[PDB]
Design a protein around this motif. Sequence first.
Motif, PDB file in Angstrom:
ATOM      1  N   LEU A  87     -88.101  42.611  78.344  1.00 14.52           N
ATOM      2  CA  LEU A  87     -87.902  41.317  77.536  1.00 14.52           C
ATOM      3  C   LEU A  87     -86.460  40.989  77.136  1.00 14.52           C
ATOM      4  CD1 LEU A  87     -90.951  41.413  75.127  1.00 14.52           C
ATOM      5  CD2 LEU A  87     -90.801  40.355  77.414  1.00 14.52           C
ATOM      6  N   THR A  88     -85.794  40.695  78.410  1.00 19.97           N
ATOM      7  CA  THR A  88     -84.438  40.500  78.337  1.00 19.97           C
ATOM      8  C   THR A  88     -84.023  39.025  78.279  1.00 19.97           C
ATOM      9  OG1 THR A  88     -84.354  40.473  80.867  1.00 19.97           O
ATOM     10  CG2 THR A  88     -83.969  42.569  79.460  1.00 19.97           C
ATOM     11  N   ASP A  89     -85.051  38.120  78.579  1.00 20.10           N
ATOM     12  CA  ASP A  89     -84.826  36.681  78.440  1.00 20.10           C
ATOM     13  C   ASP A  89     -86.000  35.992  77.794  1.00 20.10           C
ATOM     14  OD1 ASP A  89     -84.301  34.100  78.984  1.00 20.10           O
ATOM     15  OD2 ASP A  89     -83.336  34.413  80.778  1.00 20.10           O
ATOM     16  N   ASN A  90     -85.815  34.988  77.137  1.00 20.98           N
ATOM     17  CA  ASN A  90     -86.993  34.065  76.689  1.00 20.98           C
ATOM     18  C   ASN A  90     -87.646  33.524  77.625  1.00 20.98           C
ATOM     19  OD1 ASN A  90     -86.736  34.696  73.804  1.00 20.98           O
ATOM     20  ND2 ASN A  90     -85.237  32.949  73.588  1.00 20.98           N
ATOM     21  N   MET A 131     -89.026  35.358  71.583  1.00 25.42           N
ATOM     22  CA  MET A 131     -89.275  36.622  70.917  1.00 25.42           C
ATOM     23  C   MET A 131     -89.509  36.496  69.537  1.00 25.42           C
ATOM     24  SD  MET A 131     -88.292  38.847  73.095  1.00 25.42           S
ATOM     25  CE  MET A 131     -87.955  40.357  72.296  1.00 25.42           C
ATOM     26  N   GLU A 132     -89.084  35.308  68.906  1.00 27.05           N
ATOM     27  CA  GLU A 132     -89.410  34.990  67.667  1.00 27.05           C
ATOM     28  C   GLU A 132     -90.972  34.602  67.267  1.00 27.05           C
ATOM     29  OE1 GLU A 132     -87.765  35.704  64.474  1.00 27.05           O
ATOM     30  OE2 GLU A 132     -86.839  36.835  66.245  1.00 27.05           O
ATOM     31  N   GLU A 167     -88.194  45.744  64.965  1.00 26.51           N
ATOM     32  CA  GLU A 167     -87.623  46.807  65.878  1.00 26.51           C
ATOM     33  C   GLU A 167     -88.377  47.367  67.076  1.00 26.51           C
ATOM     34  OE1 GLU A 167     -85.064  49.264  63.363  1.00 26.51           O
ATOM     35  OE2 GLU A 167     -84.653  47.072  63.352  1.00 26.51           O
ATOM     36  N   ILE A 203     -86.049  26.557  69.660  1.00 23.76           N
ATOM     37  CA  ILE A 203     -86.099  28.150  69.356  1.00 23.76           C
ATOM     38  C   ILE A 203     -85.536  28.465  68.192  1.00 23.76           C
ATOM     39  CG2 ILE A 203     -85.424  30.263  70.429  1.00 23.76           C
ATOM     40  CD1 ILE A 203     -88.082  28.922  71.280  1.00 23.76           C
ATOM     41  N   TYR A 204     -84.322  27.672  68.169  1.00 27.21           N
ATOM     42  CA  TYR A 204     -83.402  27.811  66.919  1.00 27.21           C
ATOM     43  C   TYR A 204     -83.992  27.622  65.569  1.00 27.21           C
ATOM     44  CZ  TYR A 204     -79.694  27.668  63.324  1.00 27.21           C
ATOM     45  OH  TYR A 204     -78.926  27.635  62.262  1.00 27.21           O
ATOM     46  N   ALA A 244     -87.321  29.702  64.544  1.00 21.84           N
ATOM     47  CA  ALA A 244     -87.174  30.955  63.910  1.00 21.84           C
ATOM     48  C   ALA A 244     -86.688  30.604  62.668  1.00 21.84           C
ATOM     49  CB  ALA A 244     -85.955  31.714  64.470  1.00 21.84           C
ATOM     50  N   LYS A 245     -86.094  29.566  62.061  1.00 21.70           N
ATOM     51  CA  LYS A 245     -85.445  29.120  60.902  1.00 21.70           C
ATOM     52  C   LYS A 245     -86.943  28.958  60.003  1.00 21.70           C
ATOM     53  CE  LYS A 245     -83.239  25.651  58.233  1.00 21.70           C
ATOM     54  NZ  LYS A 245     -82.254  24.233  58.645  1.00 21.70           N
ATOM     55  N   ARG A 277     -83.287  25.036  73.457  1.00 23.00           N
ATOM     56  CA  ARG A 277     -82.408  26.013  72.554  1.00 23.00           C
ATOM     57  C   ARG A 277     -82.752  25.844  71.005  1.00 23.00           C
ATOM     58  NH1 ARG A 277     -81.406  31.481  73.949  1.00 23.00           N
ATOM     59  NH2 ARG A 277     -79.296  30.931  72.549  1.00 23.00           N
ATOM     60  N   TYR A 335     -87.953  44.054  69.827  1.00 23.58           N
ATOM     61  CA  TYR A 335     -86.405  44.268  70.169  1.00 23.58           C
ATOM     62  C   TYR A 335     -86.182  45.504  71.005  1.00 23.58           C
ATOM     63  CZ  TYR A 335     -85.777  39.649  68.252  1.00 23.58           C
ATOM     64  OH  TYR A 335     -85.774  38.411  67.759  1.00 23.58           O
ATOM     65  N   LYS A 336     -86.354  46.647  70.501  1.00 18.03           N
ATOM     66  CA  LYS A 336     -85.862  47.904  71.318  1.00 18.03           C
ATOM     67  C   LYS A 336     -86.629  48.128  72.473  1.00 18.03           C
ATOM     68  CE  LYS A 336     -83.912  52.132  70.037  1.00 18.03           C
ATOM     69  NZ  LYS A 336     -84.360  53.429  70.998  1.00 18.03           N
TER      70      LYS A 336
END
Lengths: 63, 52, 225, 240
Positions: free
Chosen positions: C146-149, C164-165, C129, C27-28, C31-32, C24, C132-133
């Motif tokens: 795609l509800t979970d990494n 996702m990133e 968009e 992943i954080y 994205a940063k 985690r 994610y959607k």
Amino acid sequence: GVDIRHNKDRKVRRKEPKSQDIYLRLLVKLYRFLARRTNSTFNQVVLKRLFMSRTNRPPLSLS
Amino acid sequence: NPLKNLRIMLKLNPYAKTMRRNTILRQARNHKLRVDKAAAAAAALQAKSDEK
Amino acid sequence: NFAELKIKRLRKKFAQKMLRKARRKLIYEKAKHYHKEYRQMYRTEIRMARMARKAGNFYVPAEPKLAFVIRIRGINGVSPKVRKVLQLLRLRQIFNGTFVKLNKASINMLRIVEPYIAWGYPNLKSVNELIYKRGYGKINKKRIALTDNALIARSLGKYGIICMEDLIHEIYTVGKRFKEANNFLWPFKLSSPRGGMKKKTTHFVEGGDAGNREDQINRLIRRMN
Amino acid sequence: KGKPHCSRNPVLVRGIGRYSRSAMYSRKAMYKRKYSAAKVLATVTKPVGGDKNGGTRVVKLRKMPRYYPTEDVPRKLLSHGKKPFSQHVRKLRASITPGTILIILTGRHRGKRVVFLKQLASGLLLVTGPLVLNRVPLRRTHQKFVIATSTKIDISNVKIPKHLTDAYFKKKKLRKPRHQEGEIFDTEKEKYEITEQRKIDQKAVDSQILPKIKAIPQLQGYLRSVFALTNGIYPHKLVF
RNA sequence: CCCCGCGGACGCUACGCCGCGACGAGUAGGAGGGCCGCUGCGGUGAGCCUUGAAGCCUAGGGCGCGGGCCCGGGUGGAGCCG
RNA sequence: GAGGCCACGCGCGCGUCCCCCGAAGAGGGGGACGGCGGAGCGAGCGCACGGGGUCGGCGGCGACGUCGGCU
RNA sequence: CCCCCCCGGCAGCAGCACUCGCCGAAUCCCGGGGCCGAGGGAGCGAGACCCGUCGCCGCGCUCUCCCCCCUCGGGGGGGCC
Ligand SMILES: [Mg+2]
Ligand SMILES: [Mg+2]
Ligand SMILES: [Mg+2]
Ligand SMILES: [Mg+2]
Ligand SMILES: [Mg+2]
Ligand SMILES: [Mg+2]
Ligand SMILES: [Mg+2]
Ligand SMILES: [Mg+2]
Ligand SMILES: [Mg+2]
């Protein structure tokens, strides 16, 4: 509407023996379990051969 | 839906919380600056008109 | 051995929790880092155009390498060549969308299906968009949301894409593994364009909707999903 | 154990705190609060008594069922939400403030103008268009079925009695104990009786709301009248 | 070494049960399923029936996507169905 | 030298870099980073935009007149 | 009134004096109306026993100590190197 073709959707293959031999059906049950619960591809081949017709299971001579 | 559900987005992208928090903090700081800058302009307008 | 087996399960559970915790944090931080990369690209084009104008010159930007293609016509009465190319673009339904990596081979395919599609150059927001959607993965030949990494990592982790990133970064900046990441995405099932279309039977430059609208595809996308 | 502390992370938007993980780490002083290492009796023994009955009996609580139904229902999954009604957050419209004149839209007091006092624990509004004006007692009402007008009276520094709660106003019923089949009519007690306590509370609140109503001209005449729709007037053009 | 509790839902006609994803136009034609229907035979239901079978009638109650079926009421008078 | 951020926070030893004296620019004394080194364990309450709805909310009406029955 | 100035200065700034754009990793907050609620044994833990308030994810407090502000123990804050 979607641009696809439906003539090959259903795969034609034996999912079970067409025979009603209850002894063949019992050891199909055994090899249905062994194919599912093992990684052995041998059990998978044997299971699908048990489904096959007599012409697809030719006799094997001793020689 | 992410983009609508905060925790669902945080499950997929944990960095989305700090970006969102930074945006909310930044927008409040900018809004406060524009409010105080505008009030000073009005105060200067009042002072230059009622200077006596 | 009851005490010892409890210790074994506690150590195994704690080891798995630390691994999730470390993954985690990775992943954080990625994205940063991607956020830093995106704003560097956005500012650089502004900076390059400014120094050209300062010297009286012209800065011609890089030709866009990513396209979002939307099929706008239906499936009735389609010529065989157009029908084939739309299948190769994975657009078998109206208002289906797919990201396309732009080169000579792909652009010449887009010219064939030109009356049948509307396409353009998506920006960073439009990619976010869409993924994610409406992002669905082709996992075991199934359309999985795609509800979970962990769904991305199990299919694309061998390419370094684990979240996702990472998937968005690979699509936006057309990376080494764009083909794998793009084909992993099920083609987007978009709604009808809210507010309507202008004219689906003519080209965009002649008052219609077909063809290449350069960056007005983002206006279409906002109304489309 | 130690005394509980406040959150130390102010909320700025729901679900997002003002401080980050490392900022809250230092605010909590987690650098020094580091920790590494260091029922109910189902059965009861009771003296049974009597000679040669043994000593005692190991009497268990919650004996096993005497009967089992032929089939059951599987238990539900878990929903991580869906709080009971008593735990819901109560929302009130911004136009309804204590002292606002409201218009009742439903019930026997349909169309009457009443005075809003406070929102109760269930979210139902407590109103009293004073009984001497339009015959509306201290009575609950639903904010969805009222119109908040613009006219207000300052009912600050008045004392609404504390026992005026949802349990106070909840309806009471008689039927039906000690009676299974109706062969003699049970229509008695159908006459609801106004309790002396309700009259005392009505007098107590109205004694300090009425002087504030008389303070502004012809408001009492406004409260005595009812609301109606004339043929020329349309509710979407009306400023209330 | 479980035991102050000696206890702990359902399931799995495996030709069964359960999960996930996509899809569904159709003449001529092909195939599968039919606890759709008719008649007769071998088995089986310690089946039904003069305290009322078959058949017929029915503003009666229902089931099934459907083919159809079950039940109530009447008429009928000796056989009938799973 | 009179602010902001950090998904930065145990030691010991090892490494890399920086600082001091440097009495061979030896030898020690200090900071920063480390993905390095043989040795087990945090629990206890809560709140929830969190693997598909619940209320631990309520009202009125009911026998010769009415209630329900999309067929 | 228009253009060039030797040069401008101040405010505001795609303007809350509605002249003319494209946008959001350079974007967030809040509210309203409509339709819907499919599923039903998620407990590696006590060896469960009241109907598993559970998993992933995001947080708060305590197992440290001082203060501050309201209520009369409760509530709200600053932290503590
Ligand atoms: Mg279809
Ligand atoms: Mg077909
Ligand atoms: Mg056509
Ligand atoms: Mg419209
Ligand atoms: Mg045409
Ligand atoms: Mg068909
Ligand atoms: Mg035919
Ligand atoms: Mg602006
Ligand atoms: Mg349900």
